Amino acid sequence: DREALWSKWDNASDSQRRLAEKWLPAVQAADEMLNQGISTKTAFATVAGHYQVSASTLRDKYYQVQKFAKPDWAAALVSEFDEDAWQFLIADYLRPEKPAFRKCYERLELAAREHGWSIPSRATAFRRIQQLDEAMVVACREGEHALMEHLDAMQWINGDGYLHNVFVRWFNGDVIRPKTWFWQDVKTRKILGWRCDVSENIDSIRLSFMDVVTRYGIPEDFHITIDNTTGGAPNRYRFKVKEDDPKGLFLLMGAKMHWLEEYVDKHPALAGAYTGPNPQAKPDNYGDRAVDAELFLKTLAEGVAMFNARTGRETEMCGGKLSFDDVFEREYARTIVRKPTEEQKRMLLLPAEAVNVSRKGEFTLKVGGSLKGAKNVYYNLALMLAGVKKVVVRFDPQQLHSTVYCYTLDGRFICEAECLREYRRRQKQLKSATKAAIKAQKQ
Amino acid sequence: ANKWLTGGAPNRYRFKVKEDDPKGLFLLMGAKMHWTSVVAGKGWGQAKPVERAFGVGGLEEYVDKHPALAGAYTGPYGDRAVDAELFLKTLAEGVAMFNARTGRETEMCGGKLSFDDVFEREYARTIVRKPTEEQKRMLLLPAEAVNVSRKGEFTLKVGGSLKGAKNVYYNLALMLAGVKKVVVRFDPQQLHSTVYCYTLDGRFICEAECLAAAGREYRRRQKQLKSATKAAIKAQKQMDALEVAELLP
DNA sequence: GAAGCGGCGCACGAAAAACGCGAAAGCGTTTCACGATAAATGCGAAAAC
């Protein structure tokens, strides 16, 4: 078997291979002289004469390589210690603690002393630690497991969210860190739409999508991706909105569902609000520094515009020359899209949590929050004329004073109905009664 | 053959190629090299044939003058130059046709057979040996040492005479043992698929592969996730249990 | 303002492949003997001219 021999040739150093290379023409030339029947003496004297080599060495090596085939002649020319201590050390390093090697080793020395174990050299120990596995380190921290056709413009869009590090004073006066959801065209990388709000919830996604399909339309083959590899909650309209299934609406749009920090967060105008990744940051300065919602949102819109308009984008489509806007304007004109009807757009208007319907076929929504306070009562004959107890109300905040649309709890449209700080005081009082009691318990 | 006896620029492939010495390699394969038209001590005649048509020149009829390349043929344009793939296909077919051509007037063919016929006949009457993997890999060109990341991947920036691309290669043996730098052996024609990694002192380590769609790729993704979680528990239990049982204090 | 852990480079020593000197055995071609047989030469006698 020439496998072990050739692996020995292979594993040899460059210097060793060079040595074999140097020794090969001398052995081969020698073979020629003997074939001619030249005296061994004259042949070796001649080779040792022309080539600087010991005649005896050449002779000996020739006989050694004689038994080997000629193509392989080159390849021819080329810790006992206590397992308990070793196990103890390995056991120690693999702990999530992951102590320093030299110190863990010293501890091991103490244990070895107590048990009388014969330990190997620190260098040997660590060497063997390297020899263990890439997987073992992960075994200690569970780390690696945490890592592990033609596309038209508008054909495939990706949705992503972003939590801002900038403090903004919102429309309701509260100072918060806004969260914005963005829709991006996968091919051209152009941002097609966005919506910003006080927290992460479906509304910003839904409405940014609405912005995207209203502005650019709905393609005939529509793919949407949100990599997850429901929001709702009370009551910005004083009535709760909403536990639903957005999923159905997306599938209905004819969409197949799949599962700037420099421009916004780092813009000069917000410098008092953005703190930066500062581990130590004084909280005493910031209540005054929080920027206005209008300024933040304007800076955001301009940041998006500048991100899209930025040339020198290194992508296939831009070829290091054009901007996302250029390639989007170019490719969008080569795709076939359809505009959404008024009805479709209205079906996307916001869902209110189920309200009770009386025997008379009327129900109530207590309007408030960002809208003018009022207790709206809606009515229709179809509500009293068939089976219903609870009903989901779909509405446009701007049209609450006139027409809403009632749906059954399972989603079937029934008919439309015509129209015939509050809880924050409790929230604040609760806050004070917390803080005072908390300080009193701390002391 | 003077110009053929000289290696081009070490960066003709963009990334640097290590300089070596071919004569030794030929001699090592068990080949006796000659630089003249005859073999001394043998009555075998000359290397080059007297009939031009029986030699390399005989291919000009099949290649350079083939109808598909006629527009780019200049004889012994920026719009006319033909594609590399078309030229090389025409070349391969020209070689195939040159070899398969019957009526060859040589002793062996006797005015009847083709070069292919007589070669198939005589080759079966000769004693040859197949080359082992080491021999075959040693003829590949050597690239200067490239860095290997913790993930066991390294990069080669393809360019020069080859189509530009930034090739990234990978293997598990690279992350699984001791290595920082590695020498890459390759065939320019096979850079897009398989290369062979050697240690800086010349030891072969392993070979590396160049790294509706999203879903099948997803299948292979998970399929490769589970085996990684599999070899995790395997390498665990052998060096674990009793050790972990002793650690308690 | 201070110190420790990690990583890398230099030296020692020892075992395993090695090198130069031989040397004998394997082995081929040659060796010498020794002896016996023929055959080539020695002598004489008898017949022949």
XYZ file of C-alpha atoms (C1' of nucleotides) in Angstrom:
741
model
C 0.000 0.000 0.000
C 1.306 3.351 -1.210
C -1.294 5.324 0.724
C 0.835 5.595 3.898
C 3.962 6.262 1.846
C 2.300 8.970 -0.245
C 0.818 10.503 2.901
C 4.349 10.535 4.289
C 5.523 12.307 1.135
C 2.568 14.640 1.395
C 3.111 15.439 5.081
C 6.800 16.141 4.449
C 8.326 19.590 4.815
C 9.161 21.686 1.744
C 12.837 21.299 2.702
C 12.395 17.494 2.817
C 10.644 17.363 -0.544
C 13.487 19.568 -1.870
C 15.967 17.018 -0.450
C 14.180 14.187 -2.249
C 14.173 16.285 -5.453
C 17.926 16.789 -5.113
C 18.530 13.073 -4.540
C 16.339 11.798 -7.399
C 18.400 12.641 -10.566
C 21.498 11.045 -9.010
C 19.766 7.704 -8.330
C 18.125 7.711 -11.768
C 21.367 8.599 -13.589
C 23.168 5.855 -11.666
C 20.576 3.336 -12.882
C 21.411 4.212 -16.494
C 25.125 3.487 -16.024
C 24.489 0.047 -14.509
C 22.055 -0.763 -17.325
C 24.931 -0.055 -19.720
C 26.844 -2.616 -17.635
C 29.323 -0.094 -16.289
C 31.444 -1.210 -13.342
C 29.841 -0.151 -10.062
C 33.127 1.596 -9.124
C 33.283 3.739 -12.279
C 29.554 4.565 -12.089
C 29.638 5.730 -8.452
C 32.956 7.507 -8.881
C 31.465 9.367 -11.856
C 28.224 10.287 -10.030
C 30.030 11.314 -6.820
C 32.363 13.287 -9.075
C 29.725 15.243 -11.016
C 27.258 15.465 -8.134
C 28.674 16.269 -4.714
C 27.513 13.189 -2.761
C 28.929 10.228 -0.818
C 29.182 7.226 -3.148
C 28.312 4.919 -0.224
C 25.124 6.822 0.577
C 23.958 6.739 -3.069
C 24.628 3.006 -3.254
C 22.786 2.257 -0.023
C 19.792 4.411 -0.959
C 19.633 2.861 -4.454
C 19.278 -0.568 -2.883
C 16.695 0.793 -0.453
C 14.497 2.283 -3.241
C 15.003 -0.767 -5.465
C 12.032 -2.579 -3.836
C 9.780 0.418 -4.425
C 8.136 1.284 -7.725
C 9.814 4.142 -9.603
C 7.009 6.728 -9.315
C 7.047 6.346 -5.504
C 10.847 6.604 -5.087
C 10.326 10.282 -4.144
C 7.999 9.388 -1.292
C 10.695 6.893 -0.338
C 13.396 9.609 -0.254
C 11.288 11.838 1.992
C 1.134 11.444 28.548
C 0.341 9.037 31.410
C -1.220 10.899 34.341
C -4.156 10.609 36.713
C -7.362 10.585 34.697
C -9.143 11.898 37.807
C -7.114 15.127 37.732
C -7.526 15.558 33.974
C -11.283 14.979 34.328
C -11.337 17.408 37.279
C -9.740 20.183 35.184
C -11.943 19.598 32.133
C -14.935 19.597 34.448
C -13.848 22.972 35.833
C -13.227 24.757 32.540
C -16.549 23.657 31.005
C -18.498 25.408 33.744
C -20.243 28.611 32.552
C -17.886 30.271 35.011
C -14.994 29.524 32.716
C -12.239 30.491 35.184
C -8.766 31.594 34.088
C -6.708 28.629 32.889
C -3.609 29.260 35.029
C -5.673 29.769 38.193
C -8.036 26.814 37.522
C -4.768 24.904 37.044
C -3.453 26.116 40.414
C -6.679 24.908 42.054
C -6.147 21.621 40.289
C -2.646 21.564 41.816
C -4.190 21.885 45.302
C -6.590 19.024 44.575
C -3.727 17.006 43.066
C -1.787 17.695 46.264
C -4.681 16.474 48.418
C -5.172 13.338 46.255
C -1.481 12.993 45.297
C -2.147 13.271 41.543
C 0.703 13.599 39.038
C -0.249 16.492 36.744
C 1.164 17.264 33.253
C 2.688 20.641 32.194
C 0.396 23.711 31.910
C 1.431 23.985 28.268
C 0.512 20.326 27.720
C -2.796 20.804 29.484
C -3.800 23.838 27.434
C -2.459 22.225 24.254
C -4.831 19.331 24.925
C -7.617 21.844 25.656
C -7.063 23.164 22.113
C -7.133 19.574 20.858
C -10.506 18.868 22.543
C -13.046 20.531 20.188
C -14.626 23.694 18.884
C -17.952 22.274 20.099
C -16.882 21.892 23.760
C -16.428 25.634 24.303
C -19.978 26.004 23.040
C -20.913 23.104 25.330
C -19.785 25.379 28.133
C -21.706 28.446 26.855
C -24.370 27.017 24.439
C -23.152 29.652 21.959
C -22.958 28.260 18.408
C -26.550 27.018 18.644
C -27.615 30.670 18.978
C -25.776 31.496 15.743
C -25.694 28.416 13.456
C -35.898 32.991 -10.931
C -36.051 36.716 -11.750
C -37.062 39.116 -8.977
C -39.050 42.189 -10.054
C -39.141 45.454 -8.106
C -42.043 45.332 -5.605
C -42.361 41.543 -6.147
C -40.721 40.697 -2.809
C -40.668 43.068 0.177
C -39.107 42.604 3.613
C -40.516 44.094 6.823
C -38.191 45.045 9.676
C -38.451 46.952 12.941
C -36.126 49.390 14.725
C -35.961 50.630 18.306
C -34.650 54.240 18.474
C -32.035 55.312 21.042
C -33.263 58.898 20.793
C -35.640 60.316 23.411
C -38.655 61.984 21.827
C -41.515 63.889 23.472
C -44.620 62.406 21.847
C -47.990 64.038 21.005
C -49.420 63.029 24.394
C -46.568 64.740 26.257
C -44.800 61.568 27.375
C -41.063 61.213 26.707
C -40.433 57.856 25.051
C -38.112 56.001 22.686
C -40.021 55.484 19.409
C -40.173 52.228 17.422
C -40.510 52.374 13.649
C -41.432 49.608 11.192
C -40.118 49.761 7.608
C -40.987 47.999 4.364
C -38.091 47.470 1.941
C -37.946 46.354 -1.683
C -35.559 43.387 -1.701
C -34.216 43.942 -5.246
C -33.436 47.677 -5.251
C -33.107 48.137 -1.458
C -35.349 51.236 -1.582
C -37.418 51.937 1.536
C -41.024 52.133 0.379
C -42.800 53.180 3.570
C -42.780 53.617 7.334
C -44.843 54.369 10.435
C -43.493 55.422 13.822
C -45.182 54.901 17.222
C -44.662 54.638 21.005
C -44.345 50.826 21.069
C -44.074 47.756 18.891
C -47.476 46.607 17.684
C -49.228 45.479 14.450
C -50.709 48.946 13.695
C -47.438 50.463 12.391
C -46.818 47.433 10.166
C -50.373 47.434 8.818
C -50.396 51.162 8.158
C -46.910 51.248 6.608
C -48.101 48.449 4.330
C -51.141 50.545 3.515
C -48.768 53.385 2.595
C -46.750 51.037 0.346
C -49.694 49.595 -1.603
C -51.433 52.969 -1.896
C -48.296 54.658 -3.233
C -46.823 51.942 -5.486
C -49.720 49.508 -5.927
C -50.119 45.739 -5.611
C -48.127 43.498 -7.984
C -49.747 40.394 -9.530
C -47.256 38.137 -7.757
C -46.723 39.503 -4.278
C -44.332 38.071 -1.691
C -43.908 39.465 1.817
C -41.278 38.409 4.329
C -41.102 38.950 8.088
C -38.300 36.819 9.518
C -39.456 35.455 12.909
C -36.725 32.759 12.988
C -49.982 40.488 17.664
C -49.785 43.818 19.535
C -53.148 45.411 20.281
C -53.769 46.400 23.933
C -55.933 49.399 25.059
C -57.373 52.198 23.874
C -55.737 55.188 22.145
C -59.284 55.933 20.894
C -60.657 55.304 24.441
C -61.979 52.010 23.095
C -59.637 49.009 22.763
C -57.897 48.026 19.511
C -57.505 45.101 18.664
C -57.066 41.319 18.886
C -57.277 40.145 15.255
C -55.790 38.109 12.416
C -53.830 40.485 10.086
C -52.646 37.422 8.307
C -55.997 36.969 6.535
C -55.951 40.588 5.309
C -52.446 40.127 3.816
C -53.467 36.880 2.068
C -56.535 38.775 0.774
C -54.402 41.593 -0.711
C -52.974 38.875 -2.987
C -49.782 38.638 -0.974
C -47.929 35.415 -0.204
C -46.695 35.622 3.385
C -43.313 34.205 4.471
C -41.767 33.794 7.928
C -30.292 54.678 8.982
C -29.093 54.850 12.602
C -26.510 57.172 11.063
C -29.292 59.157 9.306
C -31.814 59.308 12.201
C -30.437 58.367 15.633
C -27.078 60.077 14.895
C -28.323 63.319 13.218
C -26.894 66.555 14.798
C -30.359 68.088 15.566
C -31.197 65.280 18.041
C -27.790 65.376 19.855
C -29.414 66.226 23.178
C -31.708 63.204 22.956
C -29.556 60.434 21.472
C -27.228 59.286 24.221
C -25.138 56.970 22.112
C -23.995 53.531 23.267
C -22.709 55.187 26.492
C -22.513 52.626 29.337
C -22.401 55.440 31.908
C -24.849 58.254 31.044
C -26.180 60.897 33.453
C -30.004 60.637 33.682
C -30.241 64.158 35.233
C -29.747 65.991 31.900
C -32.315 64.258 29.654
C -35.837 65.382 30.674
C -34.922 68.752 29.141
C -33.150 67.294 26.094
C -35.904 65.018 24.670
C -36.750 66.241 21.144
C -40.179 67.102 19.708
C -42.138 64.434 17.809
C -42.378 66.711 14.752
C -38.611 67.281 14.651
C -37.824 63.605 15.152
C -40.287 62.519 12.451
C -39.053 65.194 10.022
C -35.454 64.119 10.627
C -36.633 60.520 10.104
C -38.364 61.324 6.798
C -35.320 63.256 5.564
C -33.025 60.450 6.699
C -35.068 57.960 4.686
C -35.044 60.268 1.654
C -31.259 60.682 1.912
C -30.697 56.948 2.468
C -32.643 56.181 -0.716
C -31.113 58.996 -2.771
C -27.529 58.115 -1.719
C -25.385 57.192 -4.721
C -22.331 54.906 -4.756
C -24.363 51.979 -3.477
C -22.368 48.802 -3.938
C -24.946 46.288 -5.134
C -25.371 44.351 -8.384
C -28.278 46.571 -9.452
C -26.452 49.836 -8.699
C -23.072 48.577 -9.954
C -21.256 50.935 -7.584
C -22.707 53.900 -9.484
C -26.475 54.405 -9.050
C -28.593 54.927 -5.936
C -31.468 52.808 -4.662
C -33.858 55.410 -6.105
C -32.341 55.177 -9.608
C -32.499 51.384 -9.837
C -35.981 51.319 -8.275
C -37.307 53.864 -10.780
C -35.701 51.786 -13.532
C -36.987 48.341 -12.477
C -40.451 49.398 -11.273
C -41.263 50.559 -14.805
C -40.569 46.984 -15.973
C -42.976 45.307 -13.537
C -46.750 44.863 -13.840
C -48.705 46.238 -10.860
C -52.382 47.034 -10.140
C -53.827 49.932 -8.116
C -55.936 49.119 -5.040
C -59.644 50.004 -5.093
C -61.223 52.300 -2.479
C -63.052 49.320 -0.927
C -59.832 47.313 -0.362
C -58.193 50.338 1.304
C -61.287 50.833 3.489
C -61.214 47.146 4.573
C -57.762 47.922 6.037
C -59.209 50.659 8.311
C -58.855 49.896 12.005
C -60.688 47.131 13.957
C -62.182 47.858 17.391
C -62.604 45.135 20.036
C -65.990 43.432 20.076
C -68.805 45.570 21.484
C -72.185 44.390 22.739
C -75.307 44.785 20.596
C -78.647 45.321 22.346
C -81.977 43.812 21.250
C -82.702 47.078 19.437
C -79.650 46.509 17.226
C -77.497 49.310 18.639
C -74.005 49.348 20.171
C -71.670 51.914 21.756
C -68.063 53.089 21.357
C -66.667 55.469 23.945
C -64.516 57.820 21.864
C -61.631 59.709 23.503
C -57.834 59.704 23.702
C -56.445 61.626 20.710
C -59.976 62.208 19.398
C -62.550 64.615 20.852
C -64.416 62.968 23.696
C -67.900 61.717 22.919
C -69.989 58.608 23.535
C -70.952 57.392 20.079
C -73.965 55.108 19.627
C -74.382 53.239 16.345
C -77.405 51.445 14.894
C -78.783 49.292 12.078
C -81.847 47.075 11.503
C -79.817 44.024 10.465
C -78.367 43.903 13.982
C -81.750 43.298 15.649
C -83.071 41.221 12.757
C -80.630 38.333 12.998
C -78.514 36.397 15.464
C -75.909 38.536 17.220
C -74.682 39.293 20.724
C -71.253 40.785 20.111
C -69.874 42.539 17.055
C -66.497 43.815 15.851
C -66.539 47.394 14.620
C -64.343 48.518 11.729
C -63.776 52.249 11.409
C -61.830 55.196 10.095
C -61.048 57.582 12.991
C -62.023 60.447 10.649
C -65.384 58.766 9.870
C -66.405 57.617 13.389
C -69.028 60.410 13.485
C -70.904 58.895 10.531
C -70.348 55.350 9.231
C -68.796 52.217 10.737
C -68.880 48.602 9.516
C -70.009 45.675 11.711
C -68.517 42.184 11.454
C -69.304 38.921 13.243
C -66.807 37.513 15.746
C -65.718 35.011 13.052
C -65.107 37.740 10.445
C -68.262 37.732 8.284
C -69.394 41.202 7.181
C -72.909 41.956 8.493
C -73.807 45.523 7.497
C -72.735 49.090 8.219
C -74.062 51.275 11.027
C -74.760 54.998 11.219
C -74.073 57.167 14.254
C -77.505 58.210 15.612
C -57.146 62.733 31.430
C -59.764 60.018 32.044
C -57.929 56.810 33.027
C -54.576 58.640 33.140
C -55.626 60.184 36.472
C -55.889 56.657 37.853
C -52.538 55.753 36.261
C -50.828 58.766 37.900
C -52.432 58.250 41.343
C -51.379 54.596 41.151
C -47.825 55.775 40.262
C -47.569 58.034 43.331
C -49.043 55.416 45.668
C -46.348 53.108 44.291
C -43.312 55.389 44.601
C -44.106 56.649 48.137
C -44.710 53.112 49.424
C -41.543 51.860 47.676
C -39.274 54.489 49.241
C -40.981 53.846 52.598
C -40.261 50.111 52.234
C -36.647 50.757 51.169
C -36.073 52.742 54.364
C 9.333 26.793 -26.347
C 11.275 29.629 -24.636
C 8.187 31.693 -23.717
C 6.389 28.523 -22.569
C 9.373 27.761 -20.298
C 8.684 30.901 -18.298
C 5.955 31.362 -15.673
C 3.844 34.489 -15.967
C 3.522 37.197 -13.311
C 2.893 35.780 -9.817
C -0.246 37.947 -9.672
C -1.660 36.923 -13.079
C -4.476 35.383 -11.024
C -4.752 38.508 -8.882
C -3.992 36.669 -5.618
C -0.344 35.643 -5.369
C 0.852 32.228 -6.526
C 3.881 30.583 -4.878
C 6.906 30.072 -7.146
C 8.099 26.509 -7.587
C 10.209 24.271 -9.860
C 8.470 21.967 -12.418
C 11.547 20.009 -13.812
C 11.874 18.275 -10.439
C 8.138 17.459 -10.412
C 8.362 15.798 -13.859
C 11.422 13.852 -12.863
C 9.518 12.848 -9.684
C 6.496 11.482 -11.572
C 8.890 8.914 -13.058
C 9.296 10.768 -16.332
C 12.568 11.099 -18.241
C 12.760 14.606 -19.782
C 14.479 15.406 -23.113
C 15.098 18.839 -24.726
C 15.954 17.728 -28.260
C 14.084 16.164 -31.201
C 15.221 12.610 -30.401
C 15.726 10.219 -27.500
C 19.402 9.280 -27.128
C 20.112 5.545 -27.210
C 16.761 4.724 -28.810
C 15.783 4.038 -32.407
C 12.393 5.671 -31.927
C 12.827 8.539 -34.388
C 11.812 12.142 -33.772
C 9.211 13.759 -31.533
C 7.628 16.014 -34.207
C 6.045 14.429 -37.339
C 7.130 15.225 -40.904
C 3.501 15.582 -42.020
C 2.219 18.928 -40.648
C -1.371 17.617 -40.809
C -0.451 14.900 -38.291
C 0.701 17.528 -35.783
C -0.651 20.526 -33.855
C -0.762 22.482 -37.114
C -3.342 20.011 -38.385
C -5.821 21.497 -35.891
C -6.001 24.898 -37.629
C -8.385 23.253 -40.098
C -10.632 22.115 -37.262
C -10.291 25.109 -34.899
C -8.992 28.485 -36.185
C -10.731 27.968 -39.535
C -13.962 26.455 -38.148
C -17.081 28.251 -39.529
C -18.222 29.463 -36.069
C -14.998 31.463 -35.468
C -14.587 32.751 -39.052
C -15.618 36.276 -38.074
C -12.847 36.577 -35.513
C -10.221 34.744 -37.556
C -7.402 37.110 -38.583
C -5.078 34.717 -40.398
C -1.337 34.000 -39.848
C -12.824 43.374 -34.875
C -13.800 44.665 -31.410
C -17.340 43.495 -32.250
C -16.255 40.231 -33.908
C -14.126 38.678 -31.107
C -15.735 35.346 -30.113
C -16.721 34.161 -26.622
C -14.269 32.045 -24.601
C -16.873 29.278 -24.223
C -17.494 29.093 -27.986
C -13.785 29.140 -28.809
C -12.987 26.432 -26.244
C -15.936 24.276 -27.364
C -14.834 24.613 -30.987
C -11.305 23.734 -29.809
C -12.463 20.608 -27.940
C -14.557 19.481 -30.920
C -11.656 20.205 -33.269
C -9.390 18.000 -31.164
C -12.029 15.252 -31.055
C -12.445 15.404 -34.842
C -8.681 15.512 -35.447
C -8.258 12.340 -33.380
C -11.307 10.556 -34.811
C -10.343 11.358 -38.440
C -9.788 8.193 -40.464
C -7.560 7.779 -43.521
C -4.482 8.795 -41.559
C -1.396 7.888 -43.553
C 0.991 6.522 -40.938
C 2.555 3.089 -40.392
C 0.247 2.399 -37.430
C -2.922 3.445 -39.269
C -1.850 1.919 -42.607
C -3.933 4.465 -44.507
C -7.092 2.977 -42.963
C -7.502 3.620 -39.206
C -7.644 6.855 -37.219
C -5.369 7.990 -34.412
C -8.095 6.950 -31.952
C -8.277 3.389 -33.326
C -4.533 2.734 -33.176
C -4.257 4.414 -29.760
C -7.059 2.271 -28.321
C -5.317 -0.762 -29.824
C -1.765 -0.059 -28.601
C -2.653 1.389 -25.179
C -4.213 -1.964 -24.229
C -0.795 -3.494 -24.992
C 1.096 -1.232 -22.560
C 1.615 -1.430 -18.800
C 0.617 1.779 -16.966
C -0.060 2.727 -13.322
C -2.691 5.119 -11.941
C -1.519 8.156 -9.952
C -2.412 8.352 -6.230
C -4.206 11.454 -4.898
C -0.993 13.029 -3.507
C 0.745 12.920 -6.939
C -2.344 14.395 -8.673
C -2.683 17.189 -6.083
C 1.045 18.122 -6.264
C 0.680 19.188 -9.920
C -1.902 21.775 -8.884
C -0.756 25.348 -8.597
C 0.056 26.629 -5.082
C -1.422 29.924 -3.807
C 0.294 31.946 -1.077
C -0.899 31.255 2.455
C -4.339 32.652 3.262
C -5.848 33.232 6.699
C -8.419 30.818 8.123
C -11.087 32.190 10.458
C -12.425 30.418 13.574
C -15.312 29.153 11.443
C -12.831 27.280 9.231
C -13.233 29.444 6.121
C -10.739 31.392 4.011
C -10.847 33.707 0.995
C -9.233 33.962 -2.422
C -9.744 37.053 -4.554
C -10.059 35.767 -8.110
C -9.156 38.109 -10.975
C -6.462 38.781 -13.563
C -6.963 36.387 -16.493
C -9.917 34.764 -14.721
C -13.383 36.288 -14.267
C -13.427 38.533 -11.221
C -15.044 37.094 -8.106
C -14.313 36.860 -4.393
C -14.275 33.147 -3.648
C -14.799 31.908 -0.087
C -13.900 28.322 0.766
C -14.822 26.191 3.778
C -14.387 22.879 5.598
C -15.009 21.530 9.117
C -11.456 20.221 9.566
C -10.214 23.814 9.406
C -12.113 24.895 12.541
C -11.692 21.519 14.232
C -7.915 21.554 14.580
C -4.953 23.884 14.978
C -4.559 26.311 12.089
C -4.093 30.019 11.480
C -2.747 30.128 7.938
C -3.119 27.645 5.108
C -1.682 27.141 1.624
C -4.279 26.577 -1.066
C -3.636 24.237 -3.999
C -5.886 24.680 -7.011
C -6.639 24.186 -10.668
C -7.664 27.534 -12.212
C -10.464 25.650 -14.007
C -11.686 24.159 -10.691
C -11.461 27.243 -8.427
C -15.281 27.508 -8.491
C -15.650 24.122 -6.797
C -12.806 22.280 -5.041
C -9.445 23.375 -3.644
C -6.988 21.511 -1.394
C -5.615 22.909 1.844
C -2.094 22.262 3.041
C -0.302 23.336 6.181
C 2.523 25.855 5.812
C 5.030 22.950 6.067
C 3.230 21.090 3.272
C 0.919 18.650 5.089
C -2.431 18.058 3.363
C -5.222 18.836 5.793
C -8.381 18.367 3.716
C -10.113 19.851 0.687
C -12.486 22.815 0.728
C -15.601 23.587 -1.294
C -16.533 27.026 -2.594
C -19.637 28.106 -0.630
C -37.794 27.471 -4.613
C -34.117 28.027 -3.826
C -34.481 29.544 -0.352
C -36.574 26.547 0.751
C -34.364 23.662 -0.419
C -31.395 25.616 0.908
C -33.494 25.829 4.053
C -33.846 21.992 4.040
C -30.091 21.596 3.837
C -29.788 24.321 6.503
C -31.804 22.445 9.139
C -30.419 19.065 7.989
C -26.967 20.480 8.741
C -28.160 22.036 12.072
C -29.280 18.738 13.521
C -26.006 16.919 12.765
C -24.140 19.755 14.500
C -26.303 19.370 17.567
C -25.671 15.598 17.207
C -21.879 15.754 17.215
C -22.228 18.178 20.115
C -23.705 15.567 22.518
C -21.285 12.915 21.206
C -18.138 14.917 22.022
C -19.816 15.840 25.309
C -20.593 12.489 27.011
C -17.109 11.041 26.343
C -15.322 13.864 28.199
C -18.308 14.376 30.554
C -20.389 12.472 33.117
C -17.828 11.114 35.613
C -15.745 14.313 35.294
C -18.792 16.510 35.965
C -19.683 14.190 38.837
C -16.277 14.839 40.422
C -16.472 18.643 40.062
C -19.219 19.202 42.604
C -16.944 20.851 45.226
C -2.722 54.645 38.521
C -1.803 48.994 38.409
C -1.575 43.984 37.578
C -2.795 39.581 35.654
C -3.871 36.311 31.886
C -3.016 34.932 27.575
C -0.129 33.846 23.897
C 4.349 32.985 21.468
C 9.151 32.286 20.912
C 13.633 30.096 22.350
C 16.433 25.989 24.262
C 17.326 21.435 25.965
C 17.342 16.425 25.646
C 16.051 12.226 23.813
C 14.239 8.985 20.938
C 13.681 7.390 16.307
C 15.137 7.441 11.409
C 20.287 7.776 9.431
C 24.696 7.601 7.915
C 29.388 5.635 6.773
C 31.950 1.701 7.227
C 32.302 -2.730 6.590
C 31.681 -7.597 5.938
C 29.550 -11.848 4.614
C 26.246 -14.123 2.216
C 23.888 -14.850 -1.756
C 25.128 -16.204 -6.187
C 26.932 -16.208 -10.629
C 30.487 -17.228 -13.474
C 34.784 -19.317 -13.537
C 38.383 -22.955 -11.376
C 41.276 -26.329 -10.806
C 42.055 -31.004 -10.240
C 42.135 -35.627 -10.950
C 41.703 -38.838 -13.296
C 40.675 -41.417 -16.657
C 40.353 -42.320 -21.561
C 41.805 -41.994 -26.400
C 44.570 -40.836 -29.593
C 48.603 -39.244 -31.387
C 52.805 -40.169 -31.978
C 57.230 -43.633 -31.086
C 59.693 -47.955 -32.159
C 60.782 -51.911 -34.126
C 60.135 -55.820 -36.898
C 58.506 -58.291 -40.853
C 57.222 -58.268 -45.088
C 57.742 -56.064 -49.416
C 60.513 -54.301 -53.941
